[PDB]
Amino acid sequence: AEFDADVIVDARDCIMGRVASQVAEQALDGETVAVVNAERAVITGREEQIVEKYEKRVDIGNDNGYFYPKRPDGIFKRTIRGMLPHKKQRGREAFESVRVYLGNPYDEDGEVLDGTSLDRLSNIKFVTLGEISETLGANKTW
Amino acid sequence: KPASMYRDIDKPAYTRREYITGIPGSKIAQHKMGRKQKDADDYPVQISLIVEETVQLRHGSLEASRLSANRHLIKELGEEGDYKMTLRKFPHQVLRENKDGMRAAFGKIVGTAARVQAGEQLFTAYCNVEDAEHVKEAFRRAYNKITPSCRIKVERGEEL
Amino acid sequence: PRVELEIPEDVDAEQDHLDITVEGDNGSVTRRLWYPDIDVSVDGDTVVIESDEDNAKTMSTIGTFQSHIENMFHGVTEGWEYGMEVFYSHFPMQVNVEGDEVVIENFLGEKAPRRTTIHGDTDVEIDGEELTVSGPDIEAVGQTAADIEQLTRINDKDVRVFQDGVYITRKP
Amino acid sequence: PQPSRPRKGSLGFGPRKRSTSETPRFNSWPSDDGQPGVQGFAGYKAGMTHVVLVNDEPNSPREGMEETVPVTVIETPPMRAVALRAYEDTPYGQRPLTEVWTDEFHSELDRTLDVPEDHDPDAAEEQIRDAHEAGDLGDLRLITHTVPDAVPSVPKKKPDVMETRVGGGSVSDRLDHALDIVEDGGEHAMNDIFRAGEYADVAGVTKGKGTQGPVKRWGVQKRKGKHARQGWRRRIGNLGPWNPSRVRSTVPQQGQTGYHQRTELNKRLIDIGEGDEPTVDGGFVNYGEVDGPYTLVKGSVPGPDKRLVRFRPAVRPNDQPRLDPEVRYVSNESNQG
RNA sequence: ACAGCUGGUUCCAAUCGAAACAUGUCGAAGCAUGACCUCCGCCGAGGUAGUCUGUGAGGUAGAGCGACCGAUUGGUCCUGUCAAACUCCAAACUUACAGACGCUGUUUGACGCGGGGAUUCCGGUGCGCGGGGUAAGCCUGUGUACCAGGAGGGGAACAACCCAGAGAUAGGUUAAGGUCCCCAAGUGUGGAUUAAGUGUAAUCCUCUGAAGGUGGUCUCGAGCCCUAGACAGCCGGGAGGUGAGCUUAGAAGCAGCUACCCUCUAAGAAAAGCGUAACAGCUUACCGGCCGAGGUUUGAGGCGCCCAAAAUGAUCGGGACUCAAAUCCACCACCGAGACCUGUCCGUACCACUCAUACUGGUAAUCGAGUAGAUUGG
RNA sequence: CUGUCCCAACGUUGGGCCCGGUGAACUGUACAUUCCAGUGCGGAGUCUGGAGACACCCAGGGGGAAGCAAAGACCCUAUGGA
RNA sequence: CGAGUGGCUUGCUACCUCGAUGUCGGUUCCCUCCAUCCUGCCCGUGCAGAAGCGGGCAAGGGUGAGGUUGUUCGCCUAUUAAAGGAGGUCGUGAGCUGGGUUUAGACCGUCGUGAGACAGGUCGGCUGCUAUCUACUGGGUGUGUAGGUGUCUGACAAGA
RNA sequence: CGCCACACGGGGUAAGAGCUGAACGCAUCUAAGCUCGAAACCCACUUGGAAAAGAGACACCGCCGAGGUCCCGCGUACAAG
Ligand SMILES: CO[C@H]1C[C@H](O[C@H]2[C@H](C)[C@@H](O[C@@H]3O[C@H](C)C[C@H](N(C)C)[C@H]3OC(C)=O)[C@@H](C)C[C@@]3(CO3)C(=O)[C@H](C)[C@@H](OC(C)=O)[C@@H](C)[C@@H](C)OC(=O)[C@@H]2C)O[C@@H](C)[C@@H]1OC(C)=O
Ligand SMILES: [Cl-]
Ligand SMILES: [Cl-]
Ligand SMILES: [Cl-]
Ligand SMILES: [Cl-]
Ligand SMILES: [Cl-]
Ligand SMILES: [Cl-]
Ligand SMILES: [Cl-]
Ligand SMILES: [K+]
Ligand SMILES: [Mg+2]
Ligand SMILES: [Mg+2]
Ligand SMILES: [Mg+2]
Ligand SMILES: [Mg+2]
Ligand SMILES: [Mg+2]
Ligand SMILES: [Mg+2]
Ligand SMILES: [Mg+2]
Ligand SMILES: [Mg+2]
Ligand SMILES: [Mg+2]
Ligand SMILES: [Mg+2]
Ligand SMILES: [Mg+2]
Ligand SMILES: [Mg+2]
Ligand SMILES: [Mg+2]
Ligand SMILES: [Mg+2]
Ligand SMILES: [Mg+2]
Ligand SMILES: [Mg+2]
Ligand SMILES: [Mg+2]
Ligand SMILES: [Mg+2]
Ligand SMILES: [Mg+2]
Ligand SMILES: [Mg+2]
Ligand SMILES: [Mg+2]
Ligand SMILES: [Mg+2]
Ligand code: NA
Ligand code: NA
Ligand code: NA
Ligand code: NA
Ligand code: NA
Ligand code: NA
Ligand code: NA
Ligand code: NA
Ligand code: NA
Ligand code: NA
Ligand code: NA
Ligand code: NA
Ligand code: NA
Ligand code: NA
Ligand code: NA
Ligand code: NA
Ligand code: NA
Ligand code: NA
Ligand code: NA
Ligand code: NA
Ligand code: NA
Ligand code: NA
Ligand code: NA
Ligand code: NA
Ligand code: NA
Ligand code: NA
Ligand SMILES: [Sr+2]
Ligand SMILES: [Sr+2]
Ligand SMILES: [Sr+2]
Ligand SMILES: [Sr+2]
Ligand SMILES: [Sr+2]
Ligand SMILES: [Sr+2]
Ligand SMILES: [Sr+2]
Ligand SMILES: [Sr+2]
Ligand SMILES: [Sr+2]
Ligand SMILES: [Sr+2]
Ligand SMILES: [Sr+2]
Ligand SMILES: [Sr+2]
Ligand SMILES: [Sr+2]
Ligand SMILES: [Sr+2]
Ligand SMILES: [Sr+2]
Ligand SMILES: [Sr+2]
Ligand SMILES: [Sr+2]
Ligand SMILES: [Sr+2]
Ligand SMILES: [Sr+2]
Ligand SMILES: [Sr+2]
Ligand SMILES: [Sr+2]
Ligand SMILES: [Sr+2]
Ligand SMILES: [Sr+2]
Ligand SMILES: [Sr+2]
Ligand SMILES: [Sr+2]
Ligand SMILES: [Sr+2]
Ligand SMILES: [Sr+2]
Ligand SMILES: [Sr+2]
Ligand SMILES: [Sr+2]
Ligand SMILES: [Sr+2]
Structure with missing residues (x-):
């Protein structure tokens, strides 16, 4: 429900970490970013291990807790939080001025950032965030 | 006892028997194997087992590797085959063990070891062209019972 | 490298993205041919599998893609046929094709019927103690034929004494 | 060790x-x-009495013989489905869209709700149909209350409002079925949902x-x-x-x-009826007399007497339904003695 | 009461600045005397932390032993190994004295001498070399630098690992280290490798991973065969003398013994492997055909994989990273200390002037960190 | 012989909880909402990294503060004592 | 013979605490590890079958009752699918118990001239504290979200 | 100590059994691809859960009045609340 975004980024076929690193740098530069099509975002490597790293993060916890998101919505949001000093005033403002969305709820198509796109024709060892979330046990709502 | 207690060359050279008493005899039977009457120059093929790291090999390991090497040569070439193998290293370094805590720590004599430098020949077998793959297998079994990684270097083998 | 495959007169093959569709008188086979830097294209009369890389891994798949396309040609013309024989030593095994699945009844004395589902456009025909698995996609036929052999799998007892089951007689 | x-x-x-x-x-x-x-109804717990039955189970060696079964009596008077709520499929799960209400309201529904005076049942219905056209319509559920006034032993007149789901055929046909119940007066009985012999899931606050x-x-x-x-x-x-x-x-x-929600699975409905056949002599201890629409549920049910219990057709049944069991005798003997 | 034992001992600043060692001690939780720190007076021109050369001292490393000595192989000279308490040899290196250059001293008086006051004699760590010990964040030596008593920068945190020795203030450039985000600076360039999230971990109690194994993959060399058609696969042939002889009831490619010959021919064993009681039956050698381009053998290197099991919640600091944000080879530009350069000021020391230690002017690349402690002004 | 146990239940009396009145002590370097790891004189709420965490209050049983309490009563040492 | 993993035993070392970090065993209650005893899915067999033997994946659940002994350990019995092992300050005394080790009393044996000793045995021999902080179990009051009533959604969380 | 209730099935995997298949004309379960396959995992089911700071949704009532609190009679509730 309405977010006055300055920049709208398209995560489709883009390497998650590389996008997140730029979305962080821009959030700290006062830009209001919005990451779009995060279900279709990419992460490279052997699926089997990538899933194990995320499945462990779900199983980790205690009474204090460790809230790790299962949906590709929150997974991207947490990755961005990882590149920002979110406990500081300047960092919380930056993080809160960044929102991840499933699909594209805007009118405009998002821009693909430089050096973030993965050439599917050149790569076979990767995963879609939606694939990770389906394995984690999340409800497919995209 | 494990070889980890005696494999390194960090201790001084302790060999002088005129000051060391109660040294246990070598478990090694013989250094000259096969047809010890024939010459080493009478063979077209000379293959040596070369030690890659600088270690100390105990008499028990020297014997265990020699036994499982010569036993294969006796199995494949017979008890009187046309070969001759030599174990050129002798167990000169005397080994101790502190077996009272760390007081009067200098241990009692428990055995003997052979200081072999890297690149040195531990074993050297002389054979005929046809028996070459049998001796390469005698050494593959022998290098499995010592401490370092090894090389099977053919010194007189243009026949391949 | 580049391996050019001439398409037979009986066949016509269309391609979009990474998916190749091969149509002929015996049917239609669609497969996905995806591997890094390998391009599979239609030159109207020939199918071209090419890459800029000549390493062992890439070379392995260029050869696999060839034998896949060659197999799709033979599938849409002559077809693929696997032959099987049902053997029993004490209990009369009632093999039947019921719906889209081949059902085996009273195997080794069981009250419960053993059943496996048929993969795609594969046809299983029964003529007594002989079964013939046939179709255009080798992936489908090969597996349906295998599924049948694997349906009479016995782990609990000796295979040498309890030899009952349907077995592959003819491999194409 | x-x-x-x-x-x-x-x-x-x-x-x-x-x-x-x-x-x-x-x-x-x-x-x-x-x-x-x-997909559900509700009543008010009355108490327990035993019933004699004829064994329905085909696999039981006692098939056809006399058998005593403990049963809990629950007074189940007709409920009123006052509205049809519609949900839409959003990227954040299911969310309520609009609601279709009525004109006929029970005399004392104002004790819980702020009863609708001005509503558009047509524009609400239109939004649901335009959403079904779009392929966004999730499920169809009805807002429902109880008539505790119909139950003399229960002190409260303030209705217990709760939402229930309507499932069945196509989403288009169950939209019609749903609106059809509401447009009247929303009145429905346990006979409309359940049949004696079926397995139900009884929910309750302990x-x-x-x-x-x-x-x-x-x-x-x-x-x-x-x-x-x-x-x-x-x-x-x-x-x-x-x-x-x-x-x-x-x-x-x-x-x-205690005072926890528990959903007790696979509860057999022994009998659904009306009148004073299951009432105990001297009245149900700490409840009262039963004379009206009831339900006899096999075994225990969560919660005390006077409490509201909810019904639902079993989501995971173990046995196949053996409809309308033969009732040889229902005990009316006092619970004091 | 006495105690060699625990605790405490109150204001500011400036100069120098340790010892945790040696000899003796009913001595080892203490002292004394030396080493070493500081202060004063004296003497009066040399001094020697570095280097080179010259004149001397030396037997550790290495090596070797028909060179002594003593261990320690086998054969019918030859052949196989060793040494803290061996030496025919023999360094690097350390060391005496002297000369030379350097540096230093003659108003800052060095070198030295005499006297006053100490503190100190639980040390620790890194590196090199050690000796003991299975090992140790072990014990005990030695040389050295460091912590102790050393800030600041880096290393996630962290006495001794890297940079760096530091008056105040200010501008600038770098060092170690770093440049995808967190986080200042590159999602830098040319080329290659790795697919394991290997790795993104200098050093380490701290960061493991071994013997053994690997048609995972990349690179490099050697030999041999190949359009007179190789390697493989598929087809056809694999035959006669004779079922060799002997053995044996039988043995006929194939139980065993010996031999292992010659015809046909393009090949085809007195048969390499199964198989039969023995035959038969199935391929092997060997020849031909189809086919059509490299194939086969071995050596070496690179990265990875297997080997690989632990207790509250997984980890390179975290995120997360795959033609990299990994690894290796080159290269380009930057970020980054109190270091280095630079303006002013302060303290201290010395010089000129002076009664002044009052001013004024000057010099310091060769002054400015400090626990115990000596000295001095407030 | 029996609630010692299987295996616990219900009950009685006084407390406990709420209200009026009365009214101490122990303890206190400071800061303090923690948790999982790591590091550190090798047994950290405070260091480092992450995670979690809106404030205040009532009741509880005592997991941690190597909890509070007593200059270890073991062991060694003192040119100690009885 | 050779290479290692673990950190349950023992030993070594003497880094931490002697102005005190309560013992062994047991009990109670919670979490965990896998090197798996049972259960699931597998492979081999000297796999006819049945009953086994060996190995693989696998830690969800289970692994119990008793006789001697303070015992841990261990021995023994009958049941059982099986009656696995180990970590948590050898988990757990501001929870319990106090049978053993290890105070002061006493006996026996051995040793000693003797006081008295013993890594010998034996009988008797004490269990403190009103919870400030933190932690969790449940219960409230406020503030934020910015008028109310009723119905819901589901990020995540728990389960055997 | 009594009585009632407490699945099945899907999806993806491990060990494993296979299919198609190349490097390496053959062969090969694996290198790309695919079919199966554990009491284990995920879903299913139960419980909690608008303080989820993106601090949510719907319907209706009300903003001079909707609704709530105190009050009174009581418990399907309860140590205060
Ligand atoms: C271990 O046994 C204890 C039993 C009892 O424990 C003490 C009391 C607890 C003791 O505390 C414990 O003492 C041990 C010697 C050491 C132990 N620490 C190692 C932990 C210490 O704490 C413990 C054991 O928890 C006691 C000494 C406490 C204290 C303050 O010093 C003390 O003296 C007070 C006036 C206590 O009186 C006495 C005679 O002890 C009183 C407070 C009473 C009421 O409390 C007690 O008596 C409790 C029963 O008495 C001690 C002397 C025993 O010590 C030994 C070695 O046996
Ligand atoms: Cl959690
Ligand atoms: Cl932060
Ligand atoms: Cl790839
Ligand atoms: Cl300095
Ligand atoms: Cl990873
Ligand atoms: Cl002054
Ligand atoms: Cl108890
Ligand atoms: K102590
Ligand atoms: Mg069996
Ligand atoms: Mg009664
Ligand atoms: Mg009665
Ligand atoms: Mg001073
Ligand atoms: Mg001053
Ligand atoms: Mg030497
Ligand atoms: Mg000091
Ligand atoms: Mg930056
Ligand atoms: Mg790693
Ligand atoms: Mg304590
Ligand atoms: Mg004391
Ligand atoms: Mg004493
Ligand atoms: Mg005395
Ligand atoms: Mg295992
Ligand atoms: Mg478990
Ligand atoms: Mg007992
Ligand atoms: Mg304990
Ligand atoms: Mg405790
Ligand atoms: Mg207490
Ligand atoms: Mg006793
Ligand atoms: Mg006793
Ligand atoms: Mg106590
Ligand atoms: Na990645
Ligand atoms: Na989590
Ligand atoms: Na001793
Ligand atoms: Na004294
Ligand atoms: Na002394
Ligand atoms: Na002393
Ligand atoms: Na040397
Ligand atoms: Na000079
Ligand atoms: Na000293
Ligand atoms: Na220094
Ligand atoms: Na630092
Ligand atoms: Na990693
Ligand atoms: Na000082
Ligand atoms: Na009692
Ligand atoms: Na506590
Ligand atoms: Na180990
Ligand atoms: Na130990
Ligand atoms: Na205990
Ligand atoms: Na388990
Ligand atoms: Na016992
Ligand atoms: Na303890
Ligand atoms: Na404790
Ligand atoms: Na106690
Ligand atoms: Na105890
Ligand atoms: Na008590
Ligand atoms: Na499954
Ligand atoms: Sr950037
Ligand atoms: Sr050493
Ligand atoms: Sr001792
Ligand atoms: Sr070896
Ligand atoms: Sr235990
Ligand atoms: Sr509901
Ligand atoms: Sr010297
Ligand atoms: Sr780059
Ligand atoms: Sr590059
Ligand atoms: Sr440590
Ligand atoms: Sr290392
Ligand atoms: Sr190796
Ligand atoms: Sr494991
Ligand atoms: Sr200064
Ligand atoms: Sr100074
Ligand atoms: Sr702790
Ligand atoms: Sr309490
Ligand atoms: Sr005392
Ligand atoms: Sr099993
Ligand atoms: Sr007993
Ligand atoms: Sr023990
Ligand atoms: Sr015993
Ligand atoms: Sr006792
Ligand atoms: Sr004793
Ligand atoms: Sr005893
Ligand atoms: Sr007690
Ligand atoms: Sr606020
Ligand atoms: Sr729910
Ligand atoms: Sr497999
Ligand atoms: Sr809210």
């Missing part, structure tokens, strides 16, 4: 705190099979037992032998090891017991 033993009590019904709503809320609903219908200790709450042991006389009788050994330097939430502690 210290013998093994399962932990005291289940961690699945946690946290063991007081229920938010005294009226139970189902979190699961049945699958869409046959003809469209309301008997409130206030604050109780570990022995009652978690079923831990009492201190045994010599330990029992030392000053510690009903307290556990320890609150955990040295490390971790904290008390885990898994260690049995004191607190609230």
